[PDB]
Enzyme design. Structure first.
Site, PDB file in Angstrom:
ATOM      1  N   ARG A 161      -0.037   9.338   0.210  1.00  0.00           N
ATOM      2  CA  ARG A 161      -0.850   9.485   1.583  1.00  0.00           C
ATOM      3  C   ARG A 161      -0.199   8.539   2.601  1.00  0.00           C
ATOM      4  O   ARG A 161      -0.559   8.947   3.741  1.00  0.00           O
ATOM      5  CB  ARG A 161      -2.319   9.026   1.308  1.00  0.00           C
ATOM      6  CG  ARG A 161      -2.571   7.541   1.327  1.00  0.00           C
ATOM      7  CD  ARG A 161      -4.015   7.181   0.648  1.00  0.00           C
ATOM      8  NE  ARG A 161      -3.749   6.134  -0.530  1.00  0.00           N
ATOM      9  CZ  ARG A 161      -3.644   4.875  -0.158  1.00  0.00           C
ATOM     10  NH1 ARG A 161      -3.961   4.273   0.773  1.00  0.00           N
ATOM     11  NH2 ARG A 161      -3.568   4.184  -1.320  1.00  0.00           N
ATOM     12  N   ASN A 162       0.580   7.434   2.293  1.00  0.00           N
ATOM     13  CA  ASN A 162       1.051   6.750   3.557  1.00  0.00           C
ATOM     14  C   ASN A 162       2.642   7.166   3.800  1.00  0.00           C
ATOM     15  O   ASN A 162       3.302   6.119   4.073  1.00  0.00           O
ATOM     16  CB  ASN A 162       1.068   5.343   2.992  1.00  0.00           C
ATOM     17  CG  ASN A 162      -0.365   4.810   3.079  1.00  0.00           C
ATOM     18  OD1 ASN A 162      -1.268   5.392   3.917  1.00  0.00           O
ATOM     19  ND2 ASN A 162      -0.937   3.737   2.683  1.00  0.00           N
ATOM     20  N   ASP A 214       1.705   3.239   7.463  1.00  0.00           N
ATOM     21  CA  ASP A 214       0.422   2.289   7.403  1.00  0.00           C
ATOM     22  C   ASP A 214       0.952   1.207   6.701  1.00  0.00           C
ATOM     23  O   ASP A 214       0.972   0.671   5.673  1.00  0.00           O
ATOM     24  CB  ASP A 214      -0.467   3.051   6.153  1.00  0.00           C
ATOM     25  CG  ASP A 214      -1.934   2.441   6.158  1.00  0.00           C
ATOM     26  OD1 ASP A 214      -2.108   1.395   5.969  1.00  0.00           O
ATOM     27  OD2 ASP A 214      -2.747   3.275   6.486  1.00  0.00           O
ATOM     28  N   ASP A 236       0.854  -1.206  -0.018  1.00  0.00           N
ATOM     29  CA  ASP A 236      -0.068  -0.142   0.033  1.00  0.00           C
ATOM     30  C   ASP A 236       0.782   1.318  -0.068  1.00  0.00           C
ATOM     31  O   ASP A 236       0.504   2.224   0.908  1.00  0.00           O
ATOM     32  CB  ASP A 236      -1.125   0.128   1.112  1.00  0.00           C
ATOM     33  CG  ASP A 236      -2.153   1.127   1.096  1.00  0.00           C
ATOM     34  OD1 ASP A 236      -2.715   1.221   2.020  1.00  0.00           O
ATOM     35  OD2 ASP A 236      -2.393   1.582  -0.098  1.00  0.00           O
TER      36      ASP A 236
HETATM   37  C1  LIG Z   1      -4.436  20.313   8.205  1.00  0.00           C
HETATM   38  N1  LIG Z   1      -3.705  18.999   8.362  1.00  0.00           N
HETATM   39  C2  LIG Z   1      -4.680  18.709   9.847  1.00  0.00           C
HETATM   40  C3  LIG Z   1      -4.184  17.260   9.982  1.00  0.00           C
HETATM   41  N2  LIG Z   1      -2.665  17.036  10.300  1.00  0.00           N
HETATM   42  C4  LIG Z   1      -1.991  15.926  10.674  1.00  0.00           C
HETATM   43  C5  LIG Z   1      -2.649  14.546  10.215  1.00  0.00           C
HETATM   44  C6  LIG Z   1      -2.136  13.450  10.659  1.00  0.00           C
HETATM   45  C7  LIG Z   1      -0.924  13.482  11.374  1.00  0.00           C
HETATM   46  N3  LIG Z   1      -0.288  12.457  11.873  1.00  0.00           N
HETATM   47  C8  LIG Z   1      -0.281  11.129  11.295  1.00  0.00           C
HETATM   48  O1  LIG Z   1      -1.014  10.751  10.539  1.00  0.00           O
HETATM   49  C9  LIG Z   1       0.652   9.851  11.979  1.00  0.00           C
HETATM   50  C10 LIG Z   1       0.554   8.465  11.440  1.00  0.00           C
HETATM   51  N4  LIG Z   1      -0.370   7.979  10.967  1.00  0.00           N
HETATM   52  C11 LIG Z   1      -0.794   6.831  10.414  1.00  0.00           C
HETATM   53  C12 LIG Z   1      -1.866   6.602   9.629  1.00  0.00           C
HETATM   54  C13 LIG Z   1      -2.256   5.236   9.183  1.00  0.00           C
HETATM   55  N5  LIG Z   1      -1.583   4.293   9.580  1.00  0.00           N
HETATM   56  C14 LIG Z   1      -0.505   4.350  10.439  1.00  0.00           C
HETATM   57  N6  LIG Z   1       0.425   3.279  10.997  1.00  0.00           N
HETATM   58  N7  LIG Z   1      -0.284   5.653  10.918  1.00  0.00           N
HETATM   59  C15 LIG Z   1       1.582   7.576  12.114  1.00  0.00           C
HETATM   60  C16 LIG Z   1       2.456   8.108  12.845  1.00  0.00           C
HETATM   61  N8  LIG Z   1       2.736   9.370  13.238  1.00  0.00           N
HETATM   62  C17 LIG Z   1       1.804  10.429  12.694  1.00  0.00           C
HETATM   63  O2  LIG Z   1       1.996  11.760  13.176  1.00  0.00           O
HETATM   64  C18 LIG Z   1      -0.245  14.810  11.744  1.00  0.00           C
HETATM   65  C19 LIG Z   1      -1.066  15.929  11.330  1.00  0.00           C
HETATM   66  C20 LIG Z   1      -1.902  17.744   9.003  1.00  0.00           C
HETATM   67  C21 LIG Z   1      -2.307  19.083   8.670  1.00  0.00           C
END
Ligand SMILES: CN1CCN(c2ccc(NC(=O)c3c(Nc4ccnc(N)n4)cc[nH]c3=O)cc2)CC1
Length: 301
Positions: free
Chosen positions: A142-143, A156, A138
């Site tokens: 996005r990942n 992910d 995957d």
């Molecule tokens: C306007 N936006 C609003 C949301 N904001 C944001 C979204 C997600 C993360 N963080 C993550 O998605 C994240 C992870 N996400 C995921 C997603 C799916 N699967 C896994 N294993 N991890 C994993 C580890 N650390 C992270 O910070 C950090 C910031 C970015 C600006």
């Protein structure tokens, strides 16, 4: 094969505070938080993921297994799990979120140096998963998360072993064959996603048509900023014969030579004058910032 001696850390619910929501959808939600271990005098910025049903807990513990088994600077590692009603994963906080939304929201400040360095970094992480005999299944923009604009990590798992049709190799669509060489096709699409500043691959085309489109010989178009040099690499990732595609170790080499002279391989109007945040910026790093350590600097024996 070899015994997997990785440690699965069980973290107390009472060890992490300042829980806020970052994103929600499809599976469940991803939270922002601070992890304060024992009497360690440290505050670790963390991300808490949750997909109660036994099916959701099985799928999340499968990702926990894979994430606890990886240790590379370009792969997002598991800090531990919390055994609440629904099992939640605790990983390092990548404050800037996914690369896909980052390239979309910051295109006017994204230069050739950043794009080619991102390519090298993704290839390094992907080559690590190959060394560890793990097939991601995957890989997409996005990942790939952004720790800092100059440091990205692959995320992910759960789909990782030893559907995203538009990021998939033809053998995967037709015969469900997944290999490190099919991850190379996904790498090709990921590079295209960056060079176009977050474009949807085959936008408007339904997923049921993709297989026929690829069989005919149609591939993603050459992005305007891409020289024949960079696009030639992308095309090579999309070859019918999997063994004809580049190996991730070759992708590191190729993009590294290019990253040494980025203006020769990527043509962006107003390049070099562009600047993104750095740990050298003012107020780059909300609560008591006194004892905050990044997970990359928090090691346990
Ligand atoms: C306007 N936006 C609003 C949301 N904001 C944001 C979204 C997600 C993360 N963080 C993550 O998605 C994240 C992870 N996400 C995921 C997603 C799916 N699967 C896994 N294993 N991890 C994993 C580890 N650390 C992270 O910070 C950090 C910031 C970015 C600006």
């Amino acid at each position: 094969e070899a015994p997997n001696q990785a440690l699965l850390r069980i973290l107390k619910e009472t060890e992490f505070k300042k829980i806020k929501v970052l994103g929600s959808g499809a599976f469940g939600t991803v939270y922002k938080g601070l992890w304060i271990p024992e009497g360690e005098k440290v505050k670790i910025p963390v991300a808490i993921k949750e997909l109660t049903s036994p099916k959701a807990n099985k799928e999340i513990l499968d990702e926990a297994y894979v994430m606890a088994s990886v240790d590379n600077p370009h792969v997002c590692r598991l800090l531990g799990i919390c055994l609440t009603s629904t099992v939640q994963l605790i990983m390092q906080l990548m404050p800037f979120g996914c690369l896909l939304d980052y390239v979309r929201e910051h295109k006017d400040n994204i230069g050739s140096q950043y794009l080619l360095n991102w390519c090298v970094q993704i290839a390094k992480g992907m080559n690590y998963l190959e060394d560890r005999r793990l097939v991601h299944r995957d890989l997409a923009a996005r990942n790939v998360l952004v720790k800092t604009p100059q440091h990205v990590k692959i995320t992910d798992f759960g789909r990782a072993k030893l559907v995203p049709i538009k990021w998939m190799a033809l053998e995967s669509i037709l015969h469900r064959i997944y290999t490190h060489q099919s991850d190379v096709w996904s790498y090709g699409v990921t590079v295209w996603e960056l060079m176009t500043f977050g474009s949807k691959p085959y936008d408007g085309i339904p997923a049921s048509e993709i297989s026929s489109i690829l069989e005919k010989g149609e591939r993603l178009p050459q992005p305007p900023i891409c020289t024949i040099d960079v696009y030639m690499i992308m095309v090579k990732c999309w070859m019918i014969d999997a063994d004809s595609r580049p190996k991730f170790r070759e992708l590191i080499i190729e993009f590294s030579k290019m990253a040494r002279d980025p203006q020769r391989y990527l043509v962006i109007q107003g390049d070099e004058r562009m600047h993104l945040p750095s740990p050298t910026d003012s107020n780059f790093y909300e609560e008591d910032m006194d004892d905050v350590v990044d997970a990359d600097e928090y090691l346990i024996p």
